[PDB]
Design a protein around this ligand. Structure first.
Ligand code: 7RE
Length: 164
């Protein structure tokens, strides 16, 4: 069912995350972490304290898809287990902000072609697939985008609901 999902998304905030490559999404999926640039880190920290759920929706650039979405489970922190992000040549690990712990809500992909009817009011109502890294997606668009993903039957949102 979608009911616990809808509960987790109730009054969530949603942020488009752009990964340069699949390796970093796969590391995020395996490690339950994400790191972003300071400008997005501060937005996500602000959002994490402001909303019951902060949902990161991941898209690998040039993939034409979203690769799933995750709920922030912490603010960003530094010093932890280092993550060997395959970073775009031009960026160093120091350029990144701290590390967010995330709980994956959906590890399945969704092709952009399936979200072509969703516009993001916070990006001039451009298709929700369109957005810079860190782009916040308004609640209704964000919720409908997440409900478009194939259900991820490997995930039990029971523990996620407990965190919120
Ligand atoms: C982990 C990562 N985050 C980004 O915001 C860009 C590239 C790699």
């Amino acid at each position: 069912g979608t009911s616990k999902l809808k509960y987790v998304l109730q009054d969530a905030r949603f942020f488009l995350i752009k990964s340069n490559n699949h390796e970093n999404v796969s590391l995020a999926k395996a490690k339950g972490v994400w790191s972003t640039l300071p400008v997005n880190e501060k937005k996500l920290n602000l959002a994490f304290r402001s909303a019951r759920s902060v949902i990161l929706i991941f898209s690998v650039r040039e993939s034409g898809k979203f690769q799933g979405f995750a709920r922030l489970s912490s603010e960003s922190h530094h010093g932890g287990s280092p993550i060997h992000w395959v970073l775009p040549a031009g960026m160093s690990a120091k350029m990144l902000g701290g590390v967010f712990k995330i709980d994956w809500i959906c590890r399945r992909e969704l092709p952009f072609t399936k979200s072509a009817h969703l516009t993001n009011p916070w990006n001039e109502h451009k298709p929700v697939k369109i957005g810079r890294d860190g782009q916040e997606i308004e609640l209704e668009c964000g919720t409908q985008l997440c409900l478009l993903f194939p259900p991820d039957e490997s995930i039990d949102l029971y523990q996620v609901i407990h965190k919120m």
